[PDB]
């Protein structure tokens, strides 16, 4: 359903913020 | 209603916060 | 109450965040 | 339970929205 | 259940981002 479904987004969401700001501090 | 509608919001926001974070990345790539 | 308002708090703290982080992208840009 | 991962959460983002503050502020 | 493990995976996720900001905070102070 929709808040489920809402959430599942955020997790994925929050995964590709992870592995973006990784990228970010291995250059640095 | 509230709890649908902030949930929904925080989505947004994160997409928003990943999209600028690609972009910092991408300069410094 | 309690739920409703710590969902609140992290969409609040989501839009700072994603504010501070368009400052940052916008002086790399 | 449920009530304690949101607080963890809302905690964490407190976090990481001070830590991005002091990122901005060297930059600014 | 669903909803519970789909919110610790995302307390999970946030402490990654929190750590990862610090190293980036680090660097830079």
Same mark, same amino acid.
């Given at each position: 359903?929709? !808040? $489920?479904?809402?959430? /599942? %987004?955020? $997790?994925?969401?929050? /995964? %590709? !913020? $992870?592995?973006?700001? /990784?990228? !970010? $501090?291995?250059?640095?």
């Amino acid at each position: 359903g929709e !808040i $489920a479904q809402t959430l /599942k %987004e955020q $997790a994925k969401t929050l /995964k %590709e !913020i $992870a592995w973006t700001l /990784k990228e !970010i $501090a291995q250059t640095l």
